[PDB]
Amino acid sequence: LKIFFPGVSEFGKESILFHYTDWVDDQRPENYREALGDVVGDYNFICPALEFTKKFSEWGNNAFFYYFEHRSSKLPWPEWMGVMHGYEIEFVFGLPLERRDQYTKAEEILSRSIVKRWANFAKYGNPQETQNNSTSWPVFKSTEQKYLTLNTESTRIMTKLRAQQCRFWTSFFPKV
Amino acid sequence: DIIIATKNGKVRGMQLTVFGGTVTAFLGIPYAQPPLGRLRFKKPQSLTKWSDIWNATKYANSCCQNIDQSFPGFHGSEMWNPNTDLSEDCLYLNVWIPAPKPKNATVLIWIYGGGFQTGTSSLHVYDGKFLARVERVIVVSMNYRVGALGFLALPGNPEAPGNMGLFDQQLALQWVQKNIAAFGGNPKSVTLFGESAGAASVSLHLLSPGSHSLFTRAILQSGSFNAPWAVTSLYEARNRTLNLAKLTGCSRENETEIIKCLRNKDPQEILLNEAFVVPYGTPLSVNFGPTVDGDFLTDMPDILLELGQFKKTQILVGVNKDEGTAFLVYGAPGFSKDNNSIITRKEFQEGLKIFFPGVSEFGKESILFHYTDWVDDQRPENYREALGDVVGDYNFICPALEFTKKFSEWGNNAFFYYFEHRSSKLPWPEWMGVMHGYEIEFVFGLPLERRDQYTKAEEILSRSIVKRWANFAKYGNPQETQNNSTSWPVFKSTEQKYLTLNTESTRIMTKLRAQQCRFWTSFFPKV
Amino acid sequence: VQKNIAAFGGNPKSVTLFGESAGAASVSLHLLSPGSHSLFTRAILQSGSFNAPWAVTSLYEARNRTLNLAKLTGCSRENETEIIKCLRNKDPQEILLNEAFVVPYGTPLSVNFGPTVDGDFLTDMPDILLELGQFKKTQILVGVNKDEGTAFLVYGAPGFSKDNNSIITRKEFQEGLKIFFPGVSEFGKESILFHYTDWVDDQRPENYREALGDVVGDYNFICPALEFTKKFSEWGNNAFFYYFEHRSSKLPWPEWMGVMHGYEIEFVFGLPLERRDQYTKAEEILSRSIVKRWANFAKYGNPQETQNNSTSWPVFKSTEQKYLTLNTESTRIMTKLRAQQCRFWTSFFPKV
Ligand SMILES: *[C@@H]1O[C@H](CO[C@H]2O[C@@H](C)[C@@H](O)[C@@H](O)[C@@H]2O)[C@@H](O[C@@H]2O[C@H](CO)[C@@H](O)[C@H](O)[C@H]2NC(C)=O)[C@H](O)[C@H]1NC(C)=O
Ligand SMILES: *[C@@H]1O[C@H](CO[C@H]2O[C@@H](C)[C@@H](O)[C@@H](O)[C@@H]2O)[C@@H](O[C@@H]2O[C@H](CO)[C@@H](O)[C@H](O)[C@H]2NC(C)=O)[C@H](O)[C@H]1NC(C)=O
Ligand SMILES: *[C@@H]1O[C@H](CO[C@H]2O[C@@H](C)[C@@H](O)[C@@H](O)[C@@H]2O)[C@@H](O[C@@H]2O[C@H](CO)[C@@H](O)[C@H](O)[C@H]2NC(C)=O)[C@H](O)[C@H]1NC(C)=O
Ligand SMILES: *[C@@H]1O[C@H](CO[C@H]2O[C@@H](C)[C@@H](O)[C@@H](O)[C@@H]2O)[C@@H](O[C@@H]2O[C@H](CO)[C@@H](O)[C@H](O)[C@H]2NC(C)=O)[C@H](O)[C@H]1NC(C)=O
Ligand SMILES: *[C@@H]1O[C@H](CO[C@H]2O[C@@H](C)[C@@H](O)[C@@H](O)[C@@H]2O)[C@@H](O)[C@H](O)[C@H]1NC(C)=O
Ligand SMILES: *[C@@H]1O[C@H](CO[C@H]2O[C@@H](C)[C@@H](O)[C@@H](O)[C@@H]2O)[C@@H](O)[C@H](O)[C@H]1NC(C)=O
Ligand SMILES: *[C@@H]1O[C@H](CO)[C@@H](O)[C@H](O)[C@H]1NC(C)=O
Ligand SMILES: *[C@@H]1O[C@H](CO)[C@@H](O)[C@H](O)[C@H]1NC(C)=O
Ligand SMILES: *[C@@H]1O[C@H](CO)[C@@H](O)[C@H](O)[C@H]1NC(C)=O
Ligand SMILES: *[C@@H]1O[C@H](CO)[C@@H](O)[C@H](O)[C@H]1NC(C)=O
Ligand SMILES: *[C@@H]1O[C@H](CO)[C@@H](O)[C@H](O)[C@H]1NC(C)=O
Ligand SMILES: *[C@@H]1O[C@H](CO)[C@@H](O)[C@H](O)[C@H]1NC(C)=O
Ligand SMILES: *[P@@](=O)(NCC)OCC
Ligand SMILES: [Cl-]
Ligand SMILES: [Cl-]
Ligand SMILES: [Cl-]
Ligand SMILES: [Cl-]
Ligand SMILES: [Cl-]
Ligand SMILES: [Cl-]
Ligand code: NA
Ligand code: NA
């Protein structure tokens, strides 16, 4: 935290530790390794994108939010790093559609679907995949805060991604 | 010395140390006249009354029943087998109360599953002392008759009316209405809970006029009467009564004579022939089960449910992630608890033949069509997983979801869970996942016992479930209000919100198995 | 009263409990107690509710304190019915003299022996009863005073005196928290300092003196009464909330202590209606109005003063959170008393 939050008062940093180290439970050895990742990802990318999306949508416009949870089968980085920053991009641009490339079949299908959703968004303002009995992507509103998860098995509609975490980053931390 | 005076006599209980505190257990209190001799196959009769002290210091006889002998030596299956002597003289219940005696405790009454053919209240996974200790509720459980001896039916003939086992449960609920104040319980705050057939039973006490004033609220784990195994049609019931006659050489012409004959058979000759009263059966057969008898159950209960004719109260309903896998090792080709059971398309198809006896060929093609649209045809465990889902969705999950929708459409709060935690101690192999029956130990709080080798995340999960079930029972609302827990939303038609129960993060989701159940619920009943 | 008040001309079917501070907490627990449900009609809670941090003793602390008092009276035993037997031979005075010590640290707000979840009067942690709507369904009237917390500061906070203006320093403030929040981790206490010392601006010398008062009053009385009122009203019942902001003209305590805990009570009971007594005229009129509002609440479930073109008192709901201020000039309808403060006490602090 000292590395990621240069200063950042000591209280500022205790408050992060307090919010992120309430284990269930203190048993798991990878507790702290996972918490530091979540800290960095929640502060720097996830809570801000969620707050931009809420505020933007409050003026009337359709907005669609995704949570991408697929780890590339070819990721060169180790397992503990999971579904890393930057690694949705190859799915968006359709690299997995190239069969010569050693991505799995479930990855071809995932990328094909994302490519269609992004293109429909672009052409028609709506990121649906309308032809293959796909989960329909609901608009994101303040209040319900629905989002779509993107993964090779079942995509799901969920609500209020990182609610508690972002209440911390978004409401409180800007104050320290 | 703890002696309690009941309407029928005194009973002495015993003290138990639980978690550094004390629970008093009264194991094996009688609650009806033993159903022997002339009383075999009849509704349970009133208890007569005793002076001196009945000692309720151990579990009583379990009712007569066939036993699971498929895996001798194996805990996975042997844990469900009866653990007290079998006897027709089995109409007893158990009471567990916290110490010191509570003043007006809410009461939880457990009804066990076992397909209506087996089960007993004295299993270790139904031990109510943790709940009593931890939540200061009173837990009651009862033995009721199963198999032909509990459900034989010759429609409208009082010598074999049907539903005798459900009337055992009811008379036990009556016993609590009359006696639980004496143990410090509140007859006005009674919640029935049950799993599998015990849940189906709970769901029929919701429809039975005779049970309406014997309880307050209801919990249904992995079962409801609209499951395809839970209610026997009058047609099948006669066919099965006569078939059992024939097999015991009791065919007659006067039907009260068939029954008289049957009352001379030895329990063992009845049990031994139960399996055969049906030409084909499956790992999920319920040869003798609830019927519309015009007494306990006044009309086809699908009609009662649709038309809103049941007790208006809150319900809590749930199911497990892999309800269907347990049954596959009992007859589906290529399936074994001792390997990973990768089966083939042709085995899958044979498997359906095992689970759907007939079931037209179109009927079965339609299941294959709905469940074998892979994404994609690559994964070797595709067919093994599909067969599990087929069995679990048809038999437990879609029916519980449809019961919950229909019940809630008449105005009552209903709460639905999806239990997705696999026990760290499960003796069954990994591929079987979160099996039918294996939430029960979490509900009863076994993982709260640290000596027992459950993980820490499992203690915390069970502690939370125990609190949610107790809050449901006491207050009609399964919240855990103190530890920044996810709040459990009521289940409504339209949104269909449910709570997932697991050791990491519990989540609110919507429309469990939407596509699957559209298939089972709307279309399949038609084939 | 249920059995006898008809004989004195009273209606047992129209009974309103009222209480202040611990007496209000008591009223709020008769709302949760099944045994009290049919012994009263409505309830008034002045400066107190059971969810205040001082109002309910945990079973853990209660045993620790019973045994500690045994030990101090030389009544430690092994059979517990013997501890009690022993204790029943002590002289009242030996019990009283040791009460203060059954706890290692205490504060000016200690409640060493208070309500517990006994499985009889109180059947479950009452925070769970409140959250899940398990209480008597009826109207409530709830309120607090502008400076609930100041009274307690002259009983142990450094640099505070009833005999001067008590301008304290940042370092004294911090010591003061140590007095009111025994432990309470260091982070716990930094968080209070952070929330309450964001001045506008760092100029005013009475900054820290005022913050310590607000800290004590907000944690101990105001945010809890506001949270009780929200939660109670969410189950459907009319609830009315006041903010009392009048300082008695006869208050013997110094000016800096403002509108203190306990000092609405004389207005409620109508002492200022006695002209011989040296209260001002605006105080007679204020008390007359409060007496009528409390009596209308009691008789009719509605604390209006209907005859003198008075501000009408709106019910308190979740969402708008309207309250009425009680003062000698103009009473006003306002919303969301201490919103930011109580978000801190109510949502966050219980976590530290
Ligand atoms: C109603 O029951 C009859 C009875 O048949 C059974 O005789 C019993 C004693 C028992 O041993 C049982 O296994 C045996 O089948 C059923 O009739 C049988 O149906 C099967 C399949 O259709 C035929 O192959 C048998 O020939 C036939 N037997 C007789 C005597 O007719 C009947 O199927 C059943 N009703 C249903 C639809 O399940
Ligand atoms: C997983 O085991 C099944 C179950 O049947 C077998 O159990 C094994 C552990 C072994 O002891 C074997 O003797 C026992 O019969 C296997 O299914 C069997 O597959 C074999 C193919 O060689 C057939 O001969 C059997 O008919 C069939 N058993 C039945 C009746 O269901 C299964 O093949 C095995 N699968 C694996 C290892 O992937
Ligand atoms: C539970 O009570 C014990 C008892 O300690 C007390 O003994 C009493 C007779 C009384 O005089 C009281 O002042 C004294 O503290 C508490 O244990 C004490 O805790 C303090 C602070 O942690 C320690 O400094 C003492 O050494 C310790 N004494 C003993 C005998 O162990 C204990 O703190 C209390 N529980 C809590 C958390 O308040
Ligand atoms: C306001 O008074 C406080 C209270 O303590 C003092 O009360 C005074 C009226 C006086 O009689 C004094 O004797 C009495 O102790 C003062 O706090 C005191 O500050 C002095 C600093 O000189 C310290 O010596 C004391 O420790 C401290 N008292 C304690 C124990 O709290 C306070 O300084 C004074 N403030 C003013 C005048 O602004
Ligand atoms: C025990 O409580 C009785 C009623 O309490 C219940 O009210 C019911 C309608 C139901 O909602 C329950 O969940 C409530 O708990 C009361 O009438 C009895 O007098 C009490 N018996 C005692 C304390 O002896
Ligand atoms: C006194 O009034 C009794 C009822 O009046 C009360 O009704 C209650 C439900 C409650 O709302 C109170 O506030 C009402 O004032 C009536 O039944 C008695 O008979 C009366 N007794 C007398 C006049 O002797
Ligand atoms: C639709 O599904 C088919 C397989 O049925 C697949 O070939 C194709 O990739 C899908 N189209 C899109 C846009 O995903
Ligand atoms: C009941 O148990 C007690 C054990 O103390 C015994 O005194 C009494 O004889 C028992 N009654 C029986 C076994 O019939
Ligand atoms: C059948 O036998 C019963 C039993 O004794 C008898 O009561 C009845 O009369 C008989 N039924 C008829 C009339 O066929
Ligand atoms: C609340 O959480 C605490 C840990 O902070 C734990 O000890 C306890 O099990 C929890 N209570 C419930 C009902 O889960
Ligand atoms: C404790 O003493 C009480 C008071 O006489 C007595 O009733 C009881 O038997 C004792 N408790 C035990 C068994 O330790
Ligand atoms: C109404 O106002 C009059 C003065 O016009 C005053 O005498 C009296 O105190 C008031 N009544 C109430 C209930 O305040
Ligand atoms: P349930 O009682 N349903 C089976 C028919 O589960 C145990 C087999
Ligand atoms: Cl852990
Ligand atoms: Cl999340
Ligand atoms: Cl695949
Ligand atoms: Cl699903
Ligand atoms: Cl300033
Ligand atoms: Cl304010
Ligand atoms: Na903070
Ligand atoms: Na079809």
DSSP assignment of A15-69 equals: HHHHHH---S-TT-TTHHHHHHHHHHHIIIIIHHHHHHHHHHHTTT-----EEE-
At residue C102, the 3 state secondary structure works out as coil
Of the residues B370, B371, B376, the best mutation for testing chain A's interface (the one with the most A CB atoms within 10 Å of its CB) is B376
3-state helix, strand, coil in chain C (%, to 5): 45, 10, 45
Burial of A39 (0-12, 13-18, 19+ CB in 10 A): buried
Distance CA C263, CA C246 (A): 9
Please, which residues have CB within 8 angstroms of residue C158's CB and are 6 or more apart in sequence?
C168, C172, C175, C176, C179
Burial of A103 (0-12, 13-18, 19+ CB in 10 A): buried
CB A86 within 8 A of CB A76: no
Residue C117 Cα distances to B194, C29, C38, angstroms? 30, 11, 21
Please, which residues have CB within 8 angstroms of residue A50's CB and are 6 or more apart in sequence?
A65, A145, A161, A162, A166
Overall residue count recorded for chain B in this entry: 527
Distance CA B387, CA B368 (A): 9
Distance CA C142, CA C243 (A): 9
* Touching partners of B (3+ C-beta pairs < 8 Å): A, C
What crossing angle do the helices spanning B164-179 and B197-207 adopt, rounded to 10°? Answer: 70
Q: Which of residues 16-45 of A touch C (CB under 8 A)?
A: 18
Please, which residues have CB within 8 angstroms of residue B328's CB and are 6 or more apart in sequence?
B283, B335, B341, B351, B387, B388, B391
CB under 8 Å, gap of 24 or more: what pairs does A133-138 form? Answer: A133/B515, A137/A64, A137/A66, A138/A64
Helix ranges, B356-410 (H): 361-371, 382-392, 398-408
CB B343 within 8 A of CB B335: yes
Quickly list DSSP for B249-291. T---SSHHHHHHHHTTS-HHHHHHHHTTSSSS--TT--SS---
Residue found by looking up tokens 């978004």 in the block: A170
Q: Which amino acid is at B167?
A: F
Which of B116, B312, B119 is closest to B227 using CA atoms? B116
Q: Are strands B315-320 and B217-221 parallel, antiparallel or unpaired?
A: parallel
Distance CA A97, CA B237 (A): 58
At residue B217, the 3 state secondary structure works out as strand
B403: CATH: 3.40.50.1820
CA atoms within 13 A on the CB side of C85: 6
Which of C37, C255, C267 is closest to C136 using CA atoms? C37
The edge-to-edge listing of strands for the beta sheet with C42-46 is C16-20, C42-46, C140-145, C239-244, C322-326, C333-335
Residue C233 Cα distances to B208, B292, C21, C316, C347, angstroms? 37, 46, 20, 7, 19
Residue C154 is classified by DSSP as: G
Distance CA B447, CA B457 (A): 10
| Radius of gyration for chain C, computed over Cα atoms and rounded to the nearest angstrom | 22
How far out from the chain centre does Cα C37 lie? 22
CB B440 within 8 A of CB B123: no
CB C313 within 8 A of CB C304: yes
User: What spacing in Å lies between the alpha carbon of B277 and ligand 1's midpoint?
Assistant: 8
Tokens of B156: 């409208």
Mutate to test the pocket of ligand 10, among B19, B460, B481, B501 (most ligand atoms within 8 A of CB): B460
Residue found by looking up tokens 């459990």 in the block: B488
At residue B522, the 3 state secondary structure works out as helix
Tokens of B146: 């199963």
CB C284 within 8 A of CB C273: yes
Q: Which of A24, A105, A159 sits opposite B376 (nearest CB)?
A: A105
CA atoms within 13 A on the CB side of C233: 22
Residue C265 Cα distances to B273, B402, C272, C278, angstroms? 82, 58, 11, 17
Count Cβ atoms below 10 Å from residue B259 Cβ, excluding itself. 22
Distance CA C111, CA C109 (A): 7
Tokens of B40: 């075999």
Distance CA A141, CA C40 (A): 46
Quickly list DSSP for B149-196. HHH---TT-TTS-S-HHHHHHHHHHHHHHHHGGGGTEEEEEEEEEEET
Q: Which amino acid is at C113?
A: F
Burial of A48 (0-12, 13-18, 19+ CB in 10 A): middle
By the CB < 8 Å criterion, does A15 face chain C? yes
CB B485 within 8 A of CB B365: no
Which of C197, C294, C309 is closest to A176 using CA atoms? C197
Distance CA B386, CA B324 (A): 10
Q: Residue A157: beta bridge partners?
A: A148
Count Cβ atoms below 10 Å from residue B54 Cβ, excluding itself. 17
In C102-251, DSSP assigns E strands to 140-145, 239-244
Distance CA B194, CA B186 (A): 20
Q: Which amino acid is at C324?
A: L
CB under 8 Å, gap of 24 or more: what pairs does C329-335 form? Answer: C329/C282, C334/C243
Q: Residue A34: beta bridge partners?
A: none
Which residue puts its alpha carbon closest to atom 22 of ligand 5?
B104
∠ CA(A65), CA(A69), CA(A75), 5° rounding? 130
Tokens of A88: 């949705």
Handedness of CA C220, C225, C226, C231 (dihedral sign): positive
Tell me, letter by letter, the H, E, C secondary structure of B407-467: HHCCCCCEEEEEECCCCCCCCCCHHHCCECCCCHHHHCCHHHCHHHCCCHHHHHHHHHHHH
Distance CA B199, CA B83 (A): 22
Which of B299, B365, B355 is closest to B330 using CA atoms? B355
Of the residues B188, B474, B480, B484, the best mutation for testing chain C's interface (the one with the most C CB atoms within 10 Å of its CB) is B474
Please, which residues have CB within 8 angstroms of residue C78's CB and are 6 or more apart in sequence?
none
Residue A174 Cα distances to A15, A50, A169, A170, angstroms? 12, 16, 7, 7
Which residue puts its alpha carbon closest to atom 28 of ligand 1?
B279
Please, which residues have CB within 8 angstroms of residue A87's CB and are 6 or more apart in sequence?
A71, A72, A75
Residue C260 is classified by DSSP as: B
CB C259 within 8 A of CB C288: no
Please, which residues have CB within 8 angstroms of residue B452's CB and are 6 or more apart in sequence?
B446
Distance CA C63, CA C84 (A): 12
Count Cβ atoms below 10 Å from residue C247 Cβ, excluding itself. 19
Q: Does ligand 8 lie within 6 Å of residue B55's CB atom?
A: yes
Q: Are strands B92-99 and B14-18 parallel, antiparallel or unpaired?
A: unpaired
Tokens of B31: 């609650």
Phi then psi for residue B101, to 5 deg, are: -40, 130
CB B301 within 8 A of CB B198: no
Q: Are strands B497-501 and B508-510 parallel, antiparallel or unpaired?
A: antiparallel
At residue C265, the 3 state secondary structure works out as helix
Number of folded domains that form chain C? 1
Tokens of B143: 């033995």
CB A85 within 8 A of CB A111: no
Distance CA B110, CA B202 (A): 9
At residue C107, the 3 state secondary structure works out as coil
CB C334 within 8 A of CB C320: no
CA atoms within 13 A on the CB side of B129: 19
| Radius of gyration for chain B, computed over Cα atoms and rounded to the nearest angstrom | 22
Quickly list DSSP for C24-83. HHHHHHHHH-GGGGGG-SEEEEES--TTSTTS---HHHHHHHHHHHHHHTT---SSHHHH
Burial of C66 (0-12, 13-18, 19+ CB in 10 A): middle
∠ CA(B331), CA(B334), CA(B340), 5° rounding? 115
Residue B522 Cα distances to B398, B402, B498, B517, angstroms? 11, 10, 21, 8
Q: After which residues is chain A broken (C to N over 2.5 A)?
A: none
Handedness of CA B148, B153, B154, B160 (dihedral sign): positive
By the CB < 8 Å criterion, does A132 face chain B? no
At residue A149, the 3 state secondary structure works out as strand
CB under 8 Å, gap of 24 or more: what pairs does B398-401 form? Answer: B398/B513, B398/B516, B398/B517, B398/B520, B398/B521, B399/B224, B399/B226, B399/B227, B399/B228, B399/B520, B400/B199, B400/B220, B400/B222, B400/B223, B400/B224, B400/B227, B400/B317, B400/B318, B400/B319, B401/B319, B401/B496, B401/B512, B401/B513, B401/B517
Distance CA C68, CA C102 (A): 5
Quickly list DSSP for C194-230. HHH---S-TT-TTHHHHHHHHHHHIIIIIHHHHHHHH
Longest CA span, chain A = 54
CA distance C44 to chain B (A): 26
Residue A72 is classified by DSSP as: P
Distance CA C1, CA A125 (A): 71
| Helix H or strand E encompassing C9 | none
Tokens of B5: 């005076």
Tokens of B231: 């209610």
Domain membership of residue C335 as a residue range: 1-352
Tell me, letter by letter, the H, E, C secondary structure of B289-324: CCCCCCCCCCCCHHHHHHCCCCCCCCEEEEEECECC
How far out from the chain centre does Cα C306 lie? 29
Inspect the interface and report whether the beta carbons of A104 and B515 lie closer than 8 Å. no
Q: Residue A158: beta bridge partners?
A: A147
CB B433 within 8 A of CB B325: yes
Mutate to test the pocket of ligand 9, among B157, B256, B257, B261 (most ligand atoms within 8 A of CB): B256
Tokens of A44: 């720097």
Residues with CB under 5 Å of ion ligand 16 are A 105-106; B 376, 378-379
Tokens of A112: 């094909």
Residue C182 Cα distances to B218, C177, C179, angstroms? 46, 8, 6
Phi then psi for residue B24, to 5 deg, are: -100, 125
Which of C60, C91, C46 is closest to C269 using CA atoms? C46
CA distance B15 to chain C (A): 18
What crossing angle do the helices spanning C186-196 and A10-20 adopt, rounded to 10°? Answer: 120
Tell me, letter by letter, the H, E, C secondary structure of C296-320: HHHHHCCCCCCCCCCCCCCCCCCCC
CA distance A105 to chain B (A): 7
Distance CA B182, CA B140 (A): 14
Buried b or exposed e, range C281-291, using 16+ CB within 10 angstroms: eebbebbbbbb
Q: Which amino acid is at C29?
A: L
> What method did the depositors use to determine the structure?
X-ray
From the alpha carbon of C35, which atom of ligand 5 is closest?
Answer: 23
Q: Is A85 annotated as a binding residue?
A: yes
Distance CA B230, CA B237 (A): 13
At residue B241, the 3 state secondary structure works out as helix
